[PDB]
C-alpha cells in the first residue's frame, strides 16, 4: 500500500557519473543526498559541492557554481584545511549499499556535485541523487 510519495518528498538526478545537474531547492526547506556505488572503487572519492544563483537573464535558471563553505559543529577537528565543504566517499564500499549526506546551512537556489580532480575516474562508477522535504511554496 505505497502512497503517491512522488509528491511529498520527491527526488532528482544530481550526478549520473558523467555530468552534474543543478537542481532547484526553493520550493522546499530541507534536503539531503544519496550516494550509490555501481562498482567497487579503487580509492576514496572526493566531491566538491557547489550552489548556484538565478542567472540575471532568467530568474529561474542557475548561474555559475560558487563553492559552499564548510561548517564545523562541536567536535569537528578536521576542518578540511580549506573551509570549503566537500564529501569523500571512503574506499571499500560495497556496491549494494548507500550513504546519506547534507550541508546543514544552505545558500543560493541550486545544488551541484563535482568530483574533485584526481579522483574523477572512479566518479564514472558512482551515482548521486538528491531528495527534498516538505514544500514551502
Amino acid at each position: 500500500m505505497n502512497f503517491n510519495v512522488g509528491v511529498d518528498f520527491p527526488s532528482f538526478i544530481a550526478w549520473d557519473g558523467e555530468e552534474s545537474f543543478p537542481v532547484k531547492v526553493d520550493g522546499f526547506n530541507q534536503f539531503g543526498f544519496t550516494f550509490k556505488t555501481i562498482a567497487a572503487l579503487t580509492a576514496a572519492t572526493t566531491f566538491n559541492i557547489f550552489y548556484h544563483e538565478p542567472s540575471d537573464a532568467d530568474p529561474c535558471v542557475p548561474g555559475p557554481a560558487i563553492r559552499v563553505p564548510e561548517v564545523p559543529f562541536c567536535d569537528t577537528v578536521l576542518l578540511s584545511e580549506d573551509g570549503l565543504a566537500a564529501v569523500t566517499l571512503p574506499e571499500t564500499v560495497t556496491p549494494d549499499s548507500f550513504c546519506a549526506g547534507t550541508v546543514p546551512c544552505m545558500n543560493g537556489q541550486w545544488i551541484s556535485i563535482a568530483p574533485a580532480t584526481g579522483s574523477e575516474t572512479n566518479a564514472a562508477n558512482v551515482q548521486i541523487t538528491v531528495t527534498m522535504k516538505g514544500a514551502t511554496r
Binding site: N4, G6, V7, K24, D26, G27, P59, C60
Partner: peptide, 28 residues
C-alpha cells in the same frame, strides 16, 4: 494504474497596465 499529479517550479511576474478613462473629449 499509475496516475500523475504534476506541478511547475518557476513563477513568472504578472504586470499589466492600469488604463483609465482619458481626458474628457466632446463629440464635435
Amino acid at each position: 494504474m499509475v496516475k500523475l499529479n504534476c506541478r511547475p517550479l518557476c513563477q513568472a511576474p504578472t504586470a499589466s497596465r492600469l488604463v483609465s478613462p482619458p481626458c474628457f473629449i466632446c463629440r464635435g
